[PDB]
Amino acid sequence: QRIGREIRLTPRYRYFNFLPIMLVINVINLEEAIAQRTALDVNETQVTPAS
Amino acid sequence: YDYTIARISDLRMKDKIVMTFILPNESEPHPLQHGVLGFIPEYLVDFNMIRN
């Protein structure tokens, strides 16, 4: 029961995937590593008598 | 004193006399006008409505 001019858009498209290969990497704790100093993972290769 | 006589056919004004003070030489709003007719033009609206 009301009058108005209306404007329309109808889109037509599609995304396809061909190559079945994917490599993704994840990076975490960047802020954590920057804020807190890290220094050396050194391990004491047990020439004290435990080995 | 100058006068202007106004006549009207409406019933509820039957058998009365109403008088007031009027400025005949002015056109703009002013505290010594008895009244001003607030008027803005309006124009005809013609087009088709397919309603109901």
Architecture blueprint of SSEs:
This is part of a larger assembly, with two copies of chain A.
Chain A: H1 30-35
Would you kindly provide a written description of the structure presented here, covering whatever features stand out?
The structure is cut from a larger assembly and holds 2 copies of chain A. Chain A contains 1 helix and no strands. The first copy, chain A, has one helix at 30-35. Chain A has 51 residues and is low in regular secondary structure. Helix content of chain A is 12%, strand content 0%. The PDB classes it as virus. Keywords: Klebsiella pheumoniae, Capsid, virus. Jumbo Phage phi-kp24 empty capsid hexamers.
